[PDB]
């Protein structure tokens, strides 16, 4: 038992991290088969960054302008192309550590592991959720762009994020591995705002089930509510609406604990209206919404 | 910027995880050079577990009773010996992925990354602190024993933990890689209690500095206190005493923020006496003590 924010083991992704240099700018890149993927603004100069015309900038480059380093070994670039906000560099060597992989775009409310890298060298791994407003609450410093986010299913790495930007509020924005931004952001040196955010209701309920499985029961009550009346309270507290599919997804956790989803919703309503009264749930003094139902089942099945 | 609980990249340790089977019992093991390390109670039968005489149990074993599997490839055991609560199995093949490593025992208050493994296969990575009472608040299921904890410095993996037990309270206990338990626990199928725990004061202060670096300032005040008077308040709230070495260790963070350690102590005293008044620090509604000063500097230097 125990419930901890947990990342996927990162070794399969570590074996794919390289360093891409163009001019004086060096970013992280992702080497899969004979292609390296990196943020396209590696081709920018300090003068270009306010509003680059990237098509123009890249037409003015050739293969020999890109230095790709995999460890101490330099990779020969033999082709280049634009992939929305990602640059694709064809190299003459397929990565021998390429895992089974795919490129999958995730939904707000889903989680993934981030492998933070600096100078092509992995530095830390952590978990985070795609917020409803398409930002992530990450931890990224100068030099981190091109770090990727991913999930692992059996042997397959599903890459879902490459890092590009930090907003003025200190949250982070990036693209899928096709170079398409999550949310209304652009890869320019400008201050950009996200939309208002909301709390991921289905994840809060999943985490309350995790708590019960781990012996935290003080917030439970004999009461139940209806879906409509729950969502009336949810809207008041800036919580997302709960769907029947959300209920159905919570079915297994409901069955494991013997607590109907709408019974747990009555606990959440009381927590939202009354606070915690100085108590904690799974070591937190607030309602946590960055664990999916899948994340919970992965740590709590069989407890 | 941003501050997230962050583990070390796990790939160097992933390349060392194997599976050790004795009889019907299979545990995780750690393969470094030509030695596999695992919890000694892999040799136990259901009848032996209440109070095994491990010396007797192991004398009754020979090399061919141990099946070591590294992936699909079986490793030939050519020697065995007892190492306190760890078994050492000599195999005929040195692990070609052995990283630079050492075995280091950590102090309460220090942090490390855990690579949770089941059936020799890595499943998740997370960070945790050795509590003052020598337990860890982990996430471990049936089948997890032999999973290890570690820190990485440059290229060197310092292994500090191998997992053995879950206490009745749901916290976890284990040994260093020499097989010596952290705390007053024994490897028997018995319910065991830890000593009372305390809050790691120096880590709370480190995390308050992390908060300031990340723009959370509401808890600051123009006041300062003395070390003696702070520790009088700390003792009241079950916080560890703050030493001058703790102050000295916090020096860099003090210099980066321009906030004297004893000035921050006055903020902590007010937080301890007044609570948060419904506000958060770095996304938490309680005072967090599982980040060391080193952990903070690693994410906040240069912000
Ligand atoms: C007036 O401009 C602002 C006003 C208010 C907030 C702001 N934020 C950013 C902004 O984020 N810019 C992007 C770059 C843009 C072009 C996508 C950027 O620096 N990305 C970083 C990751 C950042 C660093 C800090 N923590 C992070 O996550 C990345 O590593 C990259 N470095 C470089 C360096 C050179 C060339 C490319 C890259 S790409 C600008 C900005
Ligand atoms: C009346 O006995 C209790 C009363 C109240 C609380 C209790 N806790 C334990 C207790 O923890 N036992 C140890 C084993 C002891 C011998 C060190 C144990 O099961 N370790 C697990 C990791 C545990 C599983 C649940 N989550 C965890 O972390 C491990 O994987 C191992 N599995 C086996 C299986 C067979 C042989 C060896 C091992 S070693 C006993 C106990």
XYZ file of C-alpha atoms and ligand atoms in Angstrom:
688
model
C 0.000 0.000 0.000
C 0.902 3.666 0.022
C 0.112 6.238 -2.638
C 2.839 8.344 -4.216
C 3.073 10.505 -7.300
C 4.969 8.093 -9.500
C 6.614 8.465 -12.919
C 7.226 5.757 -15.472
C 10.783 4.355 -15.499
C 12.671 6.654 -17.837
C 15.434 4.447 -19.271
C 13.747 3.804 -22.630
C 13.506 7.571 -23.172
C 16.978 8.298 -21.782
C 18.365 6.174 -24.617
C 16.768 8.548 -27.119
C 17.995 11.933 -25.849
C 20.474 13.832 -27.983
C 21.698 17.380 -28.364
C 20.956 19.537 -31.446
C 23.031 22.657 -32.104
C 22.429 25.312 -34.745
C 24.648 28.359 -34.623
C 25.071 29.223 -30.956
C 21.770 27.629 -29.878
C 21.670 24.098 -28.456
C 18.412 22.298 -27.594
C 17.464 18.781 -26.563
C 16.329 16.421 -29.297
C 14.662 13.010 -29.515
C 16.393 10.355 -31.658
C 14.065 7.585 -32.885
C 15.062 5.320 -35.766
C 17.000 7.619 -38.151
C 15.171 10.874 -37.249
C 15.931 13.487 -34.571
C 13.024 15.666 -33.391
C 13.557 19.014 -31.680
C 11.864 22.399 -31.264
C 12.133 24.334 -34.498
C 13.388 27.505 -32.805
C 16.841 25.944 -32.514
C 17.335 27.767 -35.852
C 16.524 31.164 -34.322
C 18.936 33.976 -33.585
C 18.348 36.537 -30.840
C 17.100 38.932 -33.536
C 14.608 36.412 -34.963
C 12.780 35.479 -31.791
C 10.063 38.148 -31.374
C 8.149 36.901 -34.445
C 10.211 34.539 -36.618
C 9.113 33.568 -40.080
C 10.212 29.980 -39.594
C 9.674 28.920 -43.209
C 12.105 31.660 -44.273
C 14.582 30.838 -41.504
C 14.688 27.140 -42.446
C 14.989 27.696 -46.195
C 18.168 29.608 -45.321
C 19.635 26.536 -43.557
C 21.224 23.397 -44.967
C 22.064 20.007 -43.447
C 25.582 21.055 -42.420
C 24.179 23.818 -40.170
C 22.888 21.199 -37.700
C 25.212 19.459 -35.242
C 23.587 16.449 -33.567
C 25.444 14.863 -30.664
C 24.460 11.511 -29.168
C 26.787 11.333 -26.199
C 30.277 12.063 -27.489
C 29.412 10.762 -30.990
C 28.302 13.242 -33.652
C 25.458 12.202 -35.970
C 25.565 13.142 -39.660
C 22.470 15.106 -40.688
C 21.334 14.101 -44.184
C 17.930 15.771 -44.395
C 15.755 18.303 -42.656
C 12.132 19.344 -42.708
C 9.593 21.406 -40.807
C 6.918 19.578 -38.756
C 4.766 22.450 -37.437
C 6.721 23.688 -34.372
C 9.109 20.681 -34.462
C 12.138 20.269 -36.714
C 12.860 16.795 -38.126
C 16.497 15.974 -38.911
C 17.248 12.795 -40.842
C 20.549 11.286 -39.667
C 22.644 8.567 -41.296
C 22.366 6.212 -38.299
C 19.287 4.603 -36.787
C 19.236 4.805 -32.988
C 20.046 1.243 -31.832
C 18.165 1.906 -28.583
C 14.916 2.947 -30.281
C 12.081 1.458 -28.206
C 8.708 0.488 -29.560
C 6.993 3.855 -29.718
C 4.229 6.031 -31.036
C 3.200 9.687 -31.044
C -0.097 10.191 -29.194
C -1.754 13.477 -28.313
C -3.230 13.490 -24.832
C -6.419 15.032 -23.449
C -6.673 17.554 -20.630
C -6.988 15.609 -17.409
C -4.578 12.867 -18.523
C -1.142 12.447 -16.920
C 2.339 11.733 -18.267
C 5.966 11.518 -17.165
C 8.439 14.290 -18.022
C 12.146 13.547 -18.458
C 13.794 16.903 -17.827
C 17.045 17.175 -19.795
C 19.805 19.792 -20.020
C 22.558 19.636 -22.677
C 21.016 16.408 -23.946
C 21.642 14.853 -20.508
C 18.694 13.577 -18.412
C 18.402 15.318 -15.053
C 15.106 14.316 -13.421
C 11.781 12.620 -13.993
C 8.384 13.714 -12.719
C 4.687 13.266 -13.343
C 2.210 15.891 -14.358
C -1.288 16.333 -15.715
C -2.373 18.234 -18.795
C -4.518 20.980 -17.272
C -7.960 21.808 -18.682
C -6.398 25.056 -19.938
C -3.694 23.070 -21.810
C -0.777 24.119 -19.598
C 1.266 21.877 -17.330
C 2.626 22.719 -13.892
C 6.163 21.615 -14.634
C 9.681 22.282 -13.433
C 11.820 23.562 -16.297
C 14.862 25.849 -16.428
C 16.795 27.569 -19.187
C 18.057 24.833 -21.492
C 15.145 22.420 -20.989
C 13.312 22.868 -24.302
C 13.090 19.673 -26.291
C 12.605 17.596 -23.144
C 9.720 15.205 -23.719
C 6.759 13.747 -21.878
C 5.536 10.214 -22.303
C 3.548 7.260 -21.021
C 4.648 3.625 -21.209
C 2.236 0.786 -21.964
C 3.847 -2.658 -21.835
C 6.933 -2.167 -24.019
C 5.600 0.825 -26.017
C 6.572 4.430 -25.281
C 3.748 6.810 -26.247
C 5.355 10.233 -26.569
C 2.862 13.023 -25.964
C 4.748 16.254 -25.152
C 7.819 18.200 -26.149
C 8.682 21.260 -24.077
C 8.775 24.812 -25.545
C 7.832 27.605 -23.166
C 7.261 28.997 -19.673
C 4.355 31.399 -19.300
C 4.578 34.560 -17.162
C 2.596 32.683 -14.484
C 5.340 30.066 -14.233
C 3.359 27.225 -15.833
C 4.584 25.513 -18.982
C 3.446 25.051 -22.570
C 4.490 22.774 -25.368
C 3.505 20.639 -28.326
C 2.720 17.083 -29.207
C 5.442 15.263 -31.167
C 3.822 16.387 -34.409
C 4.724 19.946 -33.389
C 1.135 21.067 -32.703
C 0.802 23.165 -29.557
C -1.414 22.178 -26.675
C -3.612 25.250 -26.197
C -3.536 28.761 -27.700
C 0.222 29.323 -27.560
C 2.809 30.141 -30.211
C 6.583 29.626 -30.270
C 7.638 33.280 -30.025
C 9.499 35.315 -27.412
C 6.312 36.938 -26.114
C 4.296 36.916 -22.890
C 1.207 34.731 -23.369
C -1.762 33.976 -21.125
C -3.649 30.712 -20.693
C -7.392 30.478 -20.301
C -8.895 30.089 -16.864
C -8.293 26.625 -15.420
C -10.675 24.229 -13.686
C -10.375 21.279 -11.322
C -10.455 17.767 -12.816
C -13.391 16.278 -10.918
C -13.006 12.666 -12.044
C -9.385 12.691 -10.833
C -10.332 14.070 -7.407
C -12.818 11.217 -7.068
C -10.191 8.688 -8.179
C -7.831 10.022 -5.498
C -10.541 9.809 -2.813
C -10.919 6.141 -3.779
C -7.138 5.757 -3.493
C -7.415 7.241 -0.006
C -10.107 4.791 1.096
C -8.066 1.872 -0.263
C -5.168 3.165 1.850
C -7.238 3.495 5.029
C -8.211 7.196 5.011
C -11.942 7.152 5.728
C -12.763 10.243 7.820
C -14.402 12.100 4.921
C -16.934 9.363 4.138
C -20.611 9.693 4.989
C -23.791 7.634 4.798
C -25.280 10.089 2.266
C -25.547 9.922 -1.513
C -26.444 12.525 -4.151
C -27.589 12.639 -7.756
C -25.348 13.467 -10.699
C -27.340 16.596 -11.543
C -27.209 17.910 -7.972
C -23.507 17.116 -7.678
C -22.704 19.088 -10.841
C -24.674 22.060 -9.509
C -22.250 22.108 -6.563
C -19.275 21.366 -8.834
C -19.977 24.373 -11.056
C -20.026 26.583 -7.947
C -16.499 25.472 -6.986
C -14.967 25.597 -10.498
C -15.003 21.805 -10.848
C -15.567 20.146 -14.203
C -18.897 18.413 -14.791
C -18.985 14.706 -14.037
C -20.244 12.579 -16.919
C -21.747 9.117 -16.928
C -18.557 7.987 -18.674
C -16.633 9.402 -15.712
C -18.880 7.346 -13.438
C -18.327 4.270 -15.606
C -14.549 4.765 -15.585
C -14.659 4.918 -11.775
C -16.585 1.617 -11.732
C -13.655 -0.646 -10.810
C -12.594 1.574 -7.902
C -16.247 1.738 -6.850
C -16.383 -2.063 -6.913
C -13.095 -2.548 -5.055
C -14.181 -0.288 -2.171
C -17.909 -1.006 -2.215
C -18.611 2.740 -2.354
C -20.928 3.926 -5.115
C -19.585 6.794 -7.209
C -22.522 9.001 -6.233
C -21.875 8.148 -2.565
C -18.321 9.417 -2.982
C -19.721 12.467 -4.742
C -21.617 13.249 -1.526
C -18.300 13.139 0.354
C -16.736 15.473 -2.204
C -19.671 17.883 -1.927
C -19.245 17.983 1.862
C -15.481 18.465 1.510
C -16.073 21.305 -0.957
C -18.596 23.001 1.334
C -16.845 22.403 4.685
C -13.110 22.146 4.007
C -10.958 19.589 5.792
C -11.112 20.976 9.353
C -7.345 20.648 9.684
C -7.169 17.025 8.517
C -5.298 15.375 5.666
C -6.051 12.865 2.912
C -3.125 10.765 1.653
C -0.752 13.298 3.167
C -2.343 16.328 1.467
C -4.323 19.176 3.002
C -6.156 19.957 -0.264
C -8.097 17.970 -2.854
C -5.651 16.548 -5.408
C -6.701 16.318 -9.057
C -3.573 15.151 -10.947
C -4.115 11.367 -10.547
C -6.252 9.632 -13.166
C -8.422 6.599 -12.404
C -5.754 4.575 -14.239
C -2.983 6.052 -12.065
C -4.920 5.035 -8.950
C -5.672 1.475 -10.100
C -1.972 1.046 -10.947
C -0.926 1.622 -7.299
C -4.034 0.365 -5.453
C -5.140 -2.817 -7.229
C -4.829 -5.768 -4.861
C -4.455 -3.666 -1.698
C 10.920 27.758 -12.707
C 8.391 25.507 -11.036
C 8.999 23.093 -8.187
C 8.059 19.433 -8.468
C 8.926 16.313 -6.531
C 11.456 14.875 -8.937
C 13.247 11.514 -9.096
C 16.596 10.777 -10.666
C 16.422 9.235 -14.160
C 16.169 5.515 -13.524
C 17.754 3.939 -16.617
C 21.109 3.130 -14.994
C 19.270 1.173 -12.288
C 16.779 -0.407 -14.698
C 19.748 -2.073 -16.397
C 20.600 -3.798 -13.120
C 17.232 -5.322 -12.162
C 16.900 -9.088 -12.262
C 14.643 -11.738 -10.807
C 15.801 -14.256 -8.157
C 13.758 -17.405 -7.533
C 14.246 -19.960 -4.772
C 11.633 -22.665 -4.484
C 8.291 -20.989 -5.113
C 9.454 -17.535 -3.965
C 10.604 -14.918 -6.481
C 12.039 -11.532 -5.445
C 13.718 -8.651 -7.236
C 17.503 -8.597 -7.262
C 20.246 -6.121 -8.163
C 22.931 -7.307 -10.617
C 26.216 -5.370 -10.386
C 29.420 -6.760 -11.878
C 29.187 -10.541 -11.268
C 27.073 -10.366 -8.065
C 23.284 -10.344 -7.591
C 21.945 -8.830 -4.351
C 18.482 -9.629 -3.011
C 16.605 -9.908 0.289
C 17.710 -13.039 2.092
C 14.155 -14.209 2.793
C 13.877 -15.409 -0.803
C 15.061 -18.692 0.790
C 12.098 -18.806 3.187
C 9.122 -21.127 3.037
C 5.715 -20.213 4.451
C 6.593 -22.287 7.532
C 9.920 -20.493 8.090
C 8.708 -16.915 8.083
C 7.571 -16.232 11.677
C 11.152 -16.434 13.013
C 13.582 -17.980 10.511
C 17.039 -19.061 11.516
C 18.555 -17.749 8.308
C 22.013 -19.230 8.883
C 20.396 -22.677 9.101
C 18.136 -22.044 6.105
C 21.061 -20.983 3.892
C 23.379 -23.817 4.914
C 20.626 -26.100 3.596
C 20.781 -24.439 0.145
C 23.268 -24.845 -2.688
C 23.981 -22.807 -5.825
C 21.546 -24.796 -7.979
C 18.619 -23.793 -5.722
C 18.795 -20.204 -7.031
C 17.372 -19.247 -10.426
C 18.469 -15.778 -11.551
C 16.763 -14.324 -14.612
C 18.011 -11.201 -16.383
C 15.255 -10.650 -18.906
C 14.721 -13.951 -20.692
C 18.340 -15.046 -20.058
C 19.100 -17.223 -17.032
C 22.277 -16.472 -15.061
C 24.375 -19.330 -13.666
C 24.841 -19.007 -9.902
C 28.355 -20.071 -8.881
C 28.494 -18.901 -5.272
C 26.312 -17.642 -2.475
C 26.784 -15.942 0.857
C 24.879 -14.138 3.582
C 25.287 -10.338 3.891
C 23.198 -9.520 6.987
C 19.615 -9.342 5.617
C 20.816 -9.457 1.971
C 21.823 -12.556 0.022
C 24.772 -12.276 -2.389
C 24.774 -14.621 -5.391
C 27.915 -14.828 -7.511
C 27.001 -15.395 -11.171
C 29.240 -16.447 -14.055
C 28.569 -13.265 -16.063
C 29.357 -9.664 -15.191
C 26.464 -7.305 -15.925
C 27.559 -5.400 -19.064
C 25.328 -2.486 -18.032
C 26.896 -2.064 -14.585
C 27.126 1.691 -13.948
C 29.711 3.347 -11.773
C 28.272 2.723 -8.331
C 28.723 2.560 -4.606
C 26.794 1.478 -1.518
C 26.104 4.441 0.781
C 23.936 4.483 3.882
C 21.813 7.601 4.147
C 20.799 9.716 7.140
C 17.263 10.491 8.266
C 16.187 13.646 6.494
C 17.970 12.741 3.243
C 16.035 11.854 0.077
C 16.430 9.196 -2.611
C 14.681 7.778 -5.668
C 12.879 4.422 -5.509
C 12.557 2.220 -8.597
C 9.551 0.045 -7.814
C 9.866 -3.328 -9.558
C 7.610 -6.385 -9.859
C 8.839 -9.693 -11.346
C 12.203 -8.050 -11.974
C 10.450 -5.514 -14.238
C 10.568 -1.776 -13.388
C 7.126 -0.268 -12.861
C 7.519 3.259 -11.470
C 9.960 5.724 -9.978
C 9.361 8.106 -7.094
C 11.187 10.182 -4.522
C 11.056 9.826 -0.791
C 12.815 10.897 2.376
C 14.229 8.709 5.114
C 12.066 9.712 8.076
C 13.610 10.534 11.461
C 12.079 7.259 12.685
C 13.867 5.337 9.880
C 10.741 4.470 7.886
C 9.847 5.713 4.422
C 6.409 6.678 3.147
C 6.582 4.554 0.027
C 4.253 2.854 -2.412
C 4.935 -0.881 -2.484
C 2.730 -3.896 -3.224
C 3.127 -7.643 -2.891
C 6.119 -8.608 -5.014
C 8.090 -5.376 -4.538
C 10.786 -6.575 -2.123
C 14.266 -6.214 -3.527
C 13.376 -2.940 -5.241
C 16.115 -0.423 -4.515
C 16.535 3.246 -3.711
C 19.373 5.374 -4.966
C 20.831 8.789 -5.696
C 22.869 9.693 -8.776
C 25.875 12.015 -8.640
C 27.414 12.720 -12.047
C 27.801 9.207 -13.478
C 27.827 7.352 -10.120
C 24.792 5.542 -8.708
C 24.878 5.544 -4.891
C 22.542 2.756 -3.810
C 21.127 3.365 -0.348
C 17.995 1.219 0.138
C 16.624 -2.208 -0.636
C 12.976 -2.844 0.192
C 11.848 -5.497 2.736
C 8.673 -4.706 4.645
C 5.429 -2.780 5.124
C 4.544 -1.884 8.696
C 0.975 -2.133 10.041
C 0.748 1.665 9.663
C 1.355 1.367 5.924
C 4.855 2.887 5.944
C 7.848 0.928 4.700
C 11.098 -0.446 6.090
C 14.235 -1.807 4.536
C 18.003 -2.093 4.597
C 21.059 -0.512 3.114
C 22.804 -2.579 0.423
C 24.972 -4.179 3.096
C 21.777 -5.744 4.462
C 21.650 -3.631 7.644
C 18.158 -2.401 8.481
C 17.305 1.255 8.793
C 15.724 1.471 12.250
C 14.652 -1.174 14.789
C 13.094 -3.649 12.360
C 13.770 -7.306 11.613
C 13.011 -9.415 8.533
C 10.282 -11.612 10.031
C 6.569 -12.036 9.346
C 5.567 -10.014 12.409
C 3.814 -6.713 13.108
C 6.417 -4.106 14.092
C 6.113 -0.504 15.256
C 8.355 2.452 14.455
C 9.319 5.104 16.957
C 7.482 8.398 16.996
C 8.367 10.568 14.003
C 9.269 14.252 13.810
C 9.254 16.954 11.149
C 12.524 17.690 9.323
C 12.914 21.395 10.075
C 15.838 22.128 7.756
C 13.863 20.671 4.831
C 10.788 22.790 5.593
C 13.023 25.863 5.516
C 14.609 24.727 2.241
C 11.128 24.367 0.726
C 10.092 27.839 1.941
C 13.159 29.168 0.107
C 12.066 27.213 -2.977
C 8.683 28.914 -2.654
C 10.173 32.410 -2.504
C 12.353 31.656 -5.539
C 9.155 30.624 -7.339
C 7.234 33.765 -6.365
C 5.268 32.621 -3.287
C 5.874 35.384 -0.751
C 2.690 35.777 1.326
C 4.162 34.065 4.398
C 7.162 36.396 4.694
C 7.425 39.036 7.399
C 9.766 41.824 8.461
C 10.559 39.975 11.718
C 13.510 37.806 12.703
C 14.115 35.459 15.645
C 17.026 33.807 17.412
C 18.013 30.171 16.995
C 17.305 29.392 20.650
C 13.843 30.975 20.546
C 13.019 29.265 17.256
C 13.892 25.836 18.674
C 11.678 26.504 21.698
C 8.772 26.875 19.254
C 10.010 23.951 17.139
C 10.005 21.560 20.097
C 6.387 22.540 20.805
C 5.320 21.511 17.284
C 7.364 18.275 17.072
C 9.954 19.845 14.765
C 13.596 18.826 14.915
C 16.074 21.301 16.390
C 17.818 23.567 13.912
C 21.606 23.494 14.162
C 24.178 26.026 13.058
C 25.206 23.487 10.413
C 21.598 23.536 9.203
C 21.857 27.322 9.000
C 25.166 27.038 7.147
C 23.729 24.506 4.689
C 20.875 26.932 3.964
C 23.435 29.680 3.260
C 23.280 29.531 -0.548
C 19.474 29.698 -0.600
C 19.683 32.530 1.933
C 22.099 34.349 -0.376
C 20.060 33.746 -3.536
C 16.883 35.195 -1.982
C 18.458 37.785 0.303
C 16.473 36.377 3.239
C 18.457 35.482 6.348
C 17.838 31.983 7.688
C 16.639 33.375 11.017
C 14.281 35.715 9.130
C 12.759 32.680 7.433
C 12.594 30.990 10.821
C 10.319 33.837 11.947
C 8.027 33.056 9.000
C 8.009 29.376 9.949
C 7.198 30.225 13.571
C 4.234 32.334 12.424
C 3.083 29.578 10.057
C 3.327 27.041 12.886
C 1.355 29.255 15.274
C -1.253 30.598 12.814
C -1.703 27.998 10.073
C -2.083 29.013 6.443
C -5.497 30.730 6.596
C -6.653 28.787 3.548
C -3.630 29.628 1.385
C -1.083 27.434 -0.363
C 2.696 27.311 -0.759
C 4.040 25.698 -3.944
C 0.675 24.026 -4.427
C 0.537 22.501 -0.926
C -1.747 23.362 1.978
C 0.710 22.038 4.593
C 4.400 22.504 5.362
C 6.419 20.041 3.269
C 9.546 18.465 4.756
C 10.720 15.889 2.167
C 12.906 18.244 0.057
C 16.520 18.693 1.137
C 18.462 21.925 0.614
C 20.257 20.065 -2.198
C 16.939 19.064 -3.802
C 15.851 22.712 -3.769
C 19.098 24.103 -5.215
C 18.887 21.496 -8.000
C 15.551 22.913 -9.264
C 15.886 26.581 -8.225
C 19.465 27.612 -9.023
C 19.444 30.310 -11.693
C 15.729 31.117 -11.377
C 8.988 38.355 -23.873
O 9.111 36.913 -23.859
C 8.536 36.296 -22.781
C 7.822 37.012 -21.824
C 7.272 36.319 -20.759
C 7.469 34.937 -20.718
C 8.161 34.291 -21.658
N 8.457 32.988 -21.799
C 9.172 32.836 -22.916
C 9.625 31.619 -23.321
O 9.369 30.620 -22.645
N 10.392 31.521 -24.432
C 10.891 30.211 -24.919
C 11.436 30.320 -26.353
C 10.297 30.658 -27.321
C 10.886 31.157 -28.643
C 9.460 29.419 -27.622
C 11.985 29.638 -24.017
O 12.836 30.375 -23.505
N 11.939 28.301 -23.872
C 12.939 27.563 -23.082
C 12.318 26.858 -21.845
C 11.973 27.930 -20.789
C 13.247 28.542 -20.183
C 12.744 28.978 -18.807
N 11.805 27.872 -18.402
C 11.358 27.293 -19.530
O 10.544 26.372 -19.557
C 13.783 26.622 -23.953
O 14.537 25.834 -23.362
C 14.246 27.216 -25.078
N 15.319 28.011 -25.001
C 15.738 28.580 -26.164
C 16.772 29.410 -26.341
C 17.085 29.924 -27.602
C 16.304 29.552 -28.685
C 15.240 28.687 -28.463
C 14.987 28.240 -27.236
S 13.753 27.198 -26.697
C 9.330 34.052 -23.480
C 8.695 34.954 -22.698
C 2.264 -10.886 10.820
O 3.101 -10.279 9.807
C 2.859 -8.951 9.580
C 1.930 -8.239 10.333
C 1.737 -6.899 10.041
C 2.495 -6.347 9.006
C 3.375 -7.070 8.310
N 4.188 -6.732 7.295
C 4.889 -7.811 6.938
C 5.797 -7.778 5.927
O 5.989 -6.724 5.317
N 6.445 -8.911 5.565
C 7.457 -8.915 4.480
C 8.280 -10.214 4.489
C 9.119 -10.292 5.769
C 9.608 -11.729 5.970
C 10.347 -9.392 5.664
C 6.822 -8.743 3.099
O 5.744 -9.281 2.824
N 7.549 -7.998 2.246
C 7.126 -7.761 0.855
C 6.836 -6.263 0.567
C 5.506 -5.879 1.254
C 4.310 -6.559 0.566
C 3.184 -5.577 0.887
N 3.843 -4.227 0.774
C 5.156 -4.402 1.000
O 5.980 -3.490 1.015
C 8.091 -8.394 -0.158
O 7.917 -8.111 -1.353
C 8.415 -9.672 0.148
N 7.555 -10.652 -0.149
C 7.934 -11.916 0.183
C 7.249 -13.050 -0.004
C 7.766 -14.286 0.393
C 9.018 -14.325 0.984
C 9.701 -13.127 1.160
C 9.150 -11.981 0.769
S 9.758 -10.395 0.882
C 4.511 -8.836 7.732
C 3.573 -8.369 8.588
